Every structure is written in structure tokens, then in C-alpha cells.
């Protein structure tokens, strides 16, 4: 990444609507990225899996117990930092489009 | 074998993340047009 | 060995979750 992005504010979307005459979206017209930057905030990872170097045809085959611990670490990071955040992307884009 | 499944699914989720950003951009253009 | 089989079940569960996410995403017609 070309930039050292700091973390954004906590969620611009616990707004309950209020009517009178003007649209709440006039505040979100001033900055061009306002909704894209919100989705880019909710998608933001605090932890990932590292990229793994392929094992050699000369290495010792590992005891199965640690492969299960490595995979249980891996799918949990995916469930906690990707899948959940992409379902929150969807619920946000659904609510935006309906308005 | 295992390492290559983890590396592959990491790239498959980073690709879906780009799919959501390109959807958010399209909504943002209809939003401006409705203002 | 049941460790090897449990690994072979969770790989087949998580890949199904990932296909089910891609199906839930590609079905999201935002217009």
C-alpha cells in the first residue's frame, strides 16, 4: 500500500432519521468518497493470516495435531476479520440502496 | 498442501473485498445524482 | 486417524462457507 492509513472513526451509521425539509445526504455531498470510505472503514483488518512458504519435498511430515491448530487459527481469522466484515459491508450497502 | 489452501482462500476473500468497494462506488454516484 | 478426518471435514465446511459467501455476494443486485 502507498499510504500508512490510520484507523477511521467508529461508524457513521447509528443515525436515526429526522425530517424537516432538507436531506441528511447534503453533509455527505461535500466529500466525494464519503460512502466508499465508510465501506473501506468497515472492511479494515486488525489481524490477517501471513503468507505461507510451500513446504519442501525433503521436509519431515508434521504430527497431525499442529496442522489442526494452524487451520483452526486460519479459518478463525477469516471468519472474524474477512467474512463478518464483508457481511457488514452487505448490510450497510443494502440499507444505503433502500434509502 | 494445507499452506496452499490458506494462501488461496486469502486471495479469494481479498477479491470479494474489492467487489464490495466497486459496489460502494456505484451507489455513491446514484446518491449524488439523487441529491 | 480421526485428527486427519476432522481436518478433512472443516476444510470442506470452510470452503462451503466461502462458496456460500460468493453466492450471497454475486446474488446482491444493487440497482
Coordinates of N, CA and C in Angstrom, one line a residue:
Chain A
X1 N 0.8 -1.2 0.0 CA 0.0 0.0 0.0 C 0.9 1.3 0.0
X2 N 0.5 2.2 -0.8 CA 1.3 3.5 -1.0 C 1.2 4.4 0.2
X3 N 0.2 4.2 1.1 CA -0.1 5.0 2.3 C -0.1 4.2 3.6
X4 N 0.3 4.9 4.7 CA 0.1 4.4 6.0 C -1.2 5.0 6.5
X5 N -2.2 4.3 6.3 CA -3.6 4.6 6.7 C -3.8 4.4 8.2
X6 N -4.0 5.5 9.0 CA -4.6 5.3 10.4 C -6.0 4.8 10.3
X7 N -6.5 4.2 11.4 CA -7.9 3.8 11.6 C -8.9 5.0 11.6
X8 N -10.0 4.8 10.9 CA -11.1 5.8 10.8 C -12.0 5.9 12.1
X9 N -12.9 6.9 12.2 CA -13.8 7.0 13.3 C -14.8 5.8 13.4
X10 N -15.4 5.6 14.6 CA -16.4 4.4 14.8 C -17.7 4.7 14.1
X11 N -17.9 4.2 12.9 CA -19.2 4.0 12.2 C -20.2 5.2 12.1
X12 N -20.2 5.9 11.0 CA -21.1 7.0 10.6 C -22.5 6.6 10.3
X13 N -23.1 5.5 11.0 CA -24.4 4.9 10.6 C -25.3 4.5 11.8
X14 N -25.1 4.9 13.0 CA -26.2 4.8 14.1 C -27.1 6.1 14.1
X15 N -27.2 6.7 13.0 CA -28.2 7.8 12.7 C -29.6 7.2 12.7
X16 N -30.4 7.7 13.6 CA -31.9 7.6 13.4 C -32.3 8.9 12.6
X17 N -33.1 8.7 11.6 CA -33.6 9.8 10.7 C -34.4 10.9 11.5
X18 N -34.3 12.1 11.1 CA -35.2 13.2 11.4 C -35.6 14.0 10.1
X19 N -36.9 14.1 9.9 CA -37.5 15.1 8.9 C -37.5 16.5 9.5
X20 N -36.9 17.4 8.7 CA -37.6 18.6 8.3 C -36.9 19.2 7.0
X21 N -37.6 19.1 5.9 CA -37.4 19.8 4.6 C -36.1 19.4 3.8
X22 N -35.0 19.3 4.4 CA -33.7 19.0 3.8 C -33.2 17.6 4.0
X23 N -32.3 17.1 3.1 CA -31.8 15.7 3.1 C -30.6 15.5 4.0
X24 N -30.5 14.5 4.8 CA -29.3 14.2 5.6 C -28.0 14.0 4.7
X25 N -28.1 13.8 3.4 CA -27.1 13.4 2.5 C -26.3 14.7 2.0
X26 N -26.9 15.9 2.2 CA -26.2 17.1 1.9 C -24.8 17.3 2.6
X27 N -24.7 16.7 3.8 CA -23.4 16.6 4.5 C -22.4 15.6 3.9
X28 N -22.9 14.6 3.2 CA -22.1 13.5 2.5 C -21.8 13.8 1.1
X29 N -22.4 14.9 0.5 CA -22.1 15.5 -0.8 C -20.7 16.3 -0.8
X30 N -20.4 16.9 0.4 CA -19.1 17.7 0.4 C -17.9 16.9 0.1
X31 N -17.7 15.7 0.7 CA -16.5 14.9 0.4 C -16.9 13.7 -0.6
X32 N -16.2 13.6 -1.7 CA -16.6 12.7 -2.8 C -16.6 11.2 -2.4
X33 N -15.7 10.8 -1.5 CA -15.5 9.4 -1.1 C -16.4 8.9 0.0
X34 N -17.3 9.8 0.6 CA -17.9 9.6 1.9 C -18.5 8.2 2.2
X35 N -19.3 7.6 1.2 CA -19.8 6.2 1.4 C -18.7 5.1 1.1
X36 N -17.9 5.3 0.1 CA -16.8 4.4 -0.3 C -15.8 4.2 0.9
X37 N -15.4 5.3 1.5 CA -14.5 5.4 2.7 C -15.1 4.8 3.9
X38 N -16.5 4.8 4.1 CA -17.2 4.1 5.1 C -17.1 2.6 4.9
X39 N -17.4 2.1 3.7 CA -17.2 0.6 3.4 C -15.7 0.2 3.6
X40 N -14.7 1.0 3.1 CA -13.3 0.8 3.3 C -12.9 0.9 4.8
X41 N -13.7 1.5 5.7 CA -13.5 1.5 7.1 C -14.0 0.2 7.8
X42 N -15.2 -0.2 7.4 CA -15.8 -1.5 8.0 C -15.1 -2.7 7.5
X43 N -14.5 -2.7 6.3 CA -13.7 -3.8 5.8 C -12.3 -3.9 6.4
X44 N -11.9 -2.9 7.2 CA -10.5 -2.7 7.7 C -10.1 -3.9 8.7
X45 N -9.0 -4.6 8.3 CA -8.5 -5.7 9.2 C -7.6 -5.1 10.3
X46 N -7.7 -5.8 11.5 CA -6.7 -5.6 12.6 C -5.7 -6.8 12.6
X47 N -6.1 -7.9 12.1 CA -5.3 -9.2 12.0 C -5.6 -9.9 10.7
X48 N -4.5 -10.4 10.1 CA -4.6 -11.3 8.9 C -3.9 -12.6 9.2
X49 N -4.0 -13.6 8.3 CA -3.1 -14.7 8.2 C -1.8 -14.2 7.4
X50 N -0.6 -14.6 7.8 CA 0.6 -14.3 7.0 C 0.5 -15.2 5.7
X51 N 1.3 -14.8 4.7 CA 1.5 -15.7 3.5 C 2.6 -16.8 3.8
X52 N 2.2 -18.0 3.5 CA 3.0 -19.2 3.9 C 3.8 -19.8 2.7
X53 N 5.1 -20.0 3.0 CA 6.1 -20.6 2.1 C 5.8 -22.1 1.9
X54 N 5.6 -22.6 0.7 CA 5.3 -24.1 0.4 C 6.4 -25.0 1.0
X55 N 6.0 -26.0 1.8 CA 6.9 -27.0 2.4 C 7.7 -27.7 1.3
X56 N 8.9 -28.2 1.6 CA 9.9 -28.9 0.7 C 9.6 -30.4 0.6
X57 N 9.9 -31.0 -0.5 CA 9.9 -32.4 -0.7 C 10.9 -33.2 0.1
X58 N 11.8 -32.5 0.8 CA 12.8 -33.0 1.7 C 12.4 -32.9 3.2
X59 N 11.4 -32.2 3.6 CA 11.0 -32.0 5.0 C 10.3 -33.2 5.6
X60 N 10.3 -33.2 7.0 CA 9.6 -34.2 7.8 C 8.1 -33.9 7.8
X61 N 7.3 -34.9 7.6 CA 5.9 -34.8 7.7 C 5.4 -34.5 9.1
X62 N 4.7 -33.4 9.4 CA 4.4 -33.0 10.8 C 3.4 -33.9 11.5
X63 N 3.5 -34.1 12.8 CA 2.4 -34.6 13.7 C 1.0 -33.9 13.4
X64 N -0.1 -34.6 13.1 CA -1.4 -34.1 12.6 C -2.0 -33.0 13.5
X65 N -1.7 -33.1 14.8 CA -2.3 -32.2 15.9 C -2.0 -30.7 15.7
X66 N -0.8 -30.4 15.2 CA -0.4 -29.0 14.9 C -1.0 -28.4 13.6
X67 N -1.3 -29.3 12.6 CA -2.0 -28.9 11.4 C -3.4 -28.4 11.7
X68 N -4.1 -29.2 12.6 CA -5.4 -28.8 13.1 C -5.4 -27.4 13.9
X69 N -4.3 -27.2 14.7 CA -4.2 -25.9 15.4 C -3.9 -24.7 14.4
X70 N -3.1 -25.0 13.4 CA -2.8 -24.0 12.3 C -4.0 -23.6 11.5
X71 N -4.8 -24.6 11.1 CA -6.0 -24.5 10.3 C -7.1 -23.8 11.2
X72 N -7.2 -24.2 12.5 CA -8.2 -23.6 13.5 C -7.9 -22.1 13.7
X73 N -6.6 -21.7 13.7 CA -6.1 -20.3 13.7 C -6.5 -19.6 12.4
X74 N -6.3 -20.3 11.2 CA -6.5 -19.7 9.9 C -8.0 -19.4 9.6
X75 N -8.9 -20.4 9.7 CA -10.3 -20.2 9.4 C -11.0 -19.2 10.4
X76 N -10.5 -19.1 11.6 CA -11.0 -18.2 12.6 C -10.7 -16.7 12.2
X77 N -9.4 -16.5 11.8 CA -9.0 -15.1 11.3 C -9.9 -14.8 10.1
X78 N -10.2 -15.7 9.2 CA -11.1 -15.5 8.1 C -12.5 -15.2 8.5
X79 N -13.1 -16.0 9.4 CA -14.4 -15.7 10.0 C -14.5 -14.4 10.7
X80 N -13.5 -14.0 11.5 CA -13.5 -12.8 12.4 C -13.1 -11.5 11.6
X81 N -12.2 -11.5 10.6 CA -11.6 -10.3 10.0 C -12.0 -10.1 8.5
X82 N -12.5 -11.1 7.9 CA -13.0 -11.0 6.5 C -14.5 -11.3 6.3
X83 N -15.0 -12.5 6.6 CA -16.4 -12.9 6.3 C -17.3 -12.0 7.1
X84 N -17.2 -11.8 8.4 CA -18.0 -10.9 9.2 C -18.0 -9.5 8.7
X85 N -16.8 -9.0 8.3 CA -16.7 -7.6 7.8 C -17.3 -7.4 6.4
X86 N -17.3 -8.5 5.5 CA -18.0 -8.5 4.2 C -19.5 -8.7 4.3
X87 N -20.0 -9.4 5.4 CA -21.4 -9.4 5.7 C -21.9 -8.0 6.3
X88 N -21.1 -7.3 7.1 CA -21.3 -5.9 7.5 C -21.3 -4.9 6.3
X89 N -20.4 -5.2 5.3 CA -20.4 -4.4 4.0 C -21.7 -4.5 3.3
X90 N -22.3 -5.8 3.2 CA -23.5 -6.1 2.6 C -24.7 -5.4 3.3
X91 N -24.8 -5.6 4.6 CA -25.9 -5.0 5.4 C -25.9 -3.4 5.3
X92 N -24.7 -2.8 5.2 CA -24.6 -1.4 5.0 C -25.0 -0.9 3.6
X93 N -24.5 -1.6 2.5 CA -24.9 -1.3 1.1 C -26.4 -1.6 0.9
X94 N -27.0 -2.6 1.5 CA -28.4 -2.9 1.5 C -29.2 -1.7 2.0
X95 N -28.8 -1.2 3.3 CA -29.5 -0.1 3.9 C -29.3 1.2 3.1
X96 N -28.1 1.5 2.6 CA -27.9 2.7 1.7 C -28.8 2.7 0.5
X97 N -28.8 1.5 -0.3 CA -29.6 1.4 -1.5 C -31.1 1.6 -1.2
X98 N -31.6 1.0 -0.2 CA -33.1 1.1 0.2 C -33.5 2.5 0.4
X99 N -32.6 3.4 1.1 CA -32.9 4.8 1.3 C -33.0 5.6 0.0
Chain B
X1 N 0.5 -29.0 1.0 CA -0.9 -28.9 0.6 C -1.7 -27.9 1.4
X2 N -1.7 -28.0 2.8 CA -2.5 -27.0 3.6 C -2.2 -25.5 3.4
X3 N -0.9 -25.2 3.4 CA -0.5 -23.8 3.2 C -1.0 -23.1 1.9
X4 N -1.1 -23.9 0.9 CA -1.6 -23.5 -0.4 C -3.2 -23.3 -0.5
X5 N -3.9 -24.0 0.4 CA -5.3 -23.8 0.6 C -5.6 -22.5 1.3
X6 N -4.8 -22.2 2.4 CA -4.9 -21.0 3.2 C -4.5 -19.8 2.3
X7 N -3.4 -19.8 1.6 CA -2.9 -18.7 0.7 C -4.0 -18.5 -0.4
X8 N -4.6 -19.6 -0.9 CA -5.6 -19.4 -2.0 C -6.9 -18.8 -1.4
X9 N -7.4 -19.3 -0.3 CA -8.6 -18.7 0.3 C -8.4 -17.2 0.7
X10 N -7.2 -16.8 1.2 CA -6.8 -15.4 1.5 C -7.0 -14.6 0.2
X11 N -6.5 -15.0 -0.9 CA -6.7 -14.3 -2.2 C -8.1 -14.3 -2.7
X12 N -8.9 -15.3 -2.4 CA -10.3 -15.4 -2.8 C -11.2 -14.4 -1.9
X13 N -10.8 -14.2 -0.7 CA -11.5 -13.2 0.2 C -11.1 -11.7 -0.1
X14 N -9.8 -11.5 -0.4 CA -9.3 -10.2 -0.8 C -9.9 -9.7 -2.2
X15 N -10.3 -10.7 -3.0 CA -11.0 -10.4 -4.3 C -12.5 -10.0 -4.0
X16 N -13.2 -10.7 -3.1 CA -14.6 -10.3 -2.7 C -14.6 -8.9 -2.0
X17 N -13.5 -8.6 -1.2 CA -13.4 -7.2 -0.6 C -13.3 -6.1 -1.7
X18 N -12.6 -6.3 -2.8 CA -12.6 -5.4 -4.0 C -13.9 -5.4 -4.7
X19 N -14.7 -6.5 -4.7 CA -16.0 -6.5 -5.2 C -17.0 -5.5 -4.4
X20 N -16.9 -5.5 -3.1 CA -17.7 -4.6 -2.2 C -17.3 -3.1 -2.4
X21 N -16.0 -2.8 -2.6 CA -15.6 -1.4 -2.8 C -16.1 -0.9 -4.2
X22 N -16.0 -1.7 -5.2 CA -16.6 -1.3 -6.5 C -18.1 -1.2 -6.6
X23 N -18.8 -1.9 -5.7 CA -20.3 -1.7 -5.5 C -20.6 -0.4 -4.7
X24 N -19.8 -0.1 -3.7 CA -20.0 1.1 -2.9 C -19.8 2.4 -3.7
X25 N -18.8 2.4 -4.6 CA -18.5 3.4 -5.6 C -19.8 3.7 -6.5
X26 N -20.5 2.6 -7.0 CA -21.6 2.8 -7.9 C -22.8 3.4 -7.2
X27 N -23.1 3.0 -5.9 CA -24.1 3.6 -5.1 C -23.9 5.1 -4.9
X28 N -22.6 5.4 -4.6 CA -22.2 6.8 -4.4 C -22.4 7.7 -5.6
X29 N -22.4 7.2 -6.8 CA -22.8 8.0 -8.0 C -24.3 8.3 -8.1
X30 N -25.1 7.2 -7.8 CA -26.6 7.4 -7.8 C -27.1 8.3 -6.6
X31 N -26.4 8.3 -5.5 CA -26.6 9.1 -4.3 C -26.4 10.6 -4.7
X32 N -25.3 11.0 -5.3 CA -25.1 12.4 -5.8 C -26.1 12.8 -6.8
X33 N -26.5 11.9 -7.8 CA -27.5 12.2 -8.8 C -28.9 12.4 -8.2
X34 N -29.2 11.7 -7.1 CA -30.5 11.9 -6.4 C -30.4 13.2 -5.5
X35 N -29.3 13.6 -5.0 CA -29.2 14.9 -4.3 C -29.4 16.1 -5.4
Chain C
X1 N -7.2 -42.4 11.1 CA -6.9 -41.5 12.2 C -8.0 -40.4 12.2
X2 N -8.7 -40.1 13.3 CA -9.7 -39.1 13.5 C -9.3 -37.6 13.4
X3 N -8.0 -37.3 13.7 CA -7.4 -36.0 13.5 C -7.4 -35.6 12.0
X4 N -6.9 -36.5 11.2 CA -6.9 -36.3 9.7 C -8.3 -36.2 9.1
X5 N -9.3 -36.9 9.6 CA -10.7 -36.8 9.2 C -11.4 -35.5 9.7
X6 N -11.1 -35.0 10.9 CA -11.7 -33.7 11.4 C -11.1 -32.5 10.6
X7 N -9.8 -32.6 10.2 CA -9.2 -31.6 9.3 C -9.9 -31.7 7.9
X8 N -10.2 -32.9 7.4 CA -10.9 -33.1 6.1 C -12.4 -32.7 6.1
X9 N -13.0 -32.6 7.3 CA -14.4 -32.1 7.4 C -14.4 -30.5 7.5
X10 N -13.6 -29.9 8.4 CA -13.5 -28.4 8.5 C -13.0 -27.7 7.2
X11 N -12.1 -28.3 6.5 CA -11.7 -27.8 5.1 C -12.9 -27.8 4.2
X12 N -13.7 -28.9 4.2 CA -14.9 -29.0 3.4 C -16.1 -28.1 4.0
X13 N -16.1 -27.7 5.3 CA -17.0 -26.8 5.8 C -16.7 -25.3 5.5
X14 N -15.4 -24.9 5.7 CA -15.0 -23.6 5.4 C -15.0 -23.2 3.9
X15 N -14.7 -24.2 3.0 CA -14.8 -24.0 1.6 C -16.3 -23.8 1.2
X16 N -17.2 -24.5 1.8 CA -18.6 -24.3 1.6 C -19.1 -23.0 2.1
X17 N -18.6 -22.5 3.3 CA -18.9 -21.1 3.7 C -18.4 -20.0 2.8
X18 N -17.2 -20.2 2.2 CA -16.6 -19.3 1.2 C -17.4 -19.3 -0.1
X19 N -17.8 -20.5 -0.7 CA -18.7 -20.5 -1.8 C -20.1 -19.9 -1.5
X20 N -20.6 -20.1 -0.3 CA -21.9 -19.6 0.1 C -21.8 -18.0 0.3
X21 N -20.7 -17.5 0.8 CA -20.4 -16.0 0.7 C -20.4 -15.5 -0.7
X22 N -19.6 -16.1 -1.6 CA -19.6 -15.7 -3.0 C -21.0 -15.8 -3.7
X23 N -21.8 -16.8 -3.4 CA -23.2 -16.9 -3.8 C -24.0 -15.8 -3.3
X24 N -23.9 -15.5 -2.0 CA -24.6 -14.3 -1.3 C -24.2 -13.0 -1.8
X25 N -22.9 -12.8 -2.3 CA -22.4 -11.6 -2.9 C -22.8 -11.4 -4.3
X26 N -22.6 -12.4 -5.2 CA -23.0 -12.3 -6.6 C -24.5 -12.2 -6.8
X27 N -25.3 -12.7 -5.9 CA -26.7 -12.5 -5.9 C -27.2 -11.1 -5.4
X28 N -26.3 -10.3 -4.9 CA -26.6 -8.9 -4.4 C -26.8 -7.9 -5.5
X29 N -27.9 -7.9 -6.2 CA -28.2 -7.0 -7.3 C -28.6 -5.6 -6.7
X30 N -27.6 -4.7 -6.6 CA -27.7 -3.4 -6.2 C -28.0 -2.5 -7.4
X31 N -29.3 -2.1 -7.6 CA -29.7 -1.2 -8.6 C -30.7 -0.2 -8.1

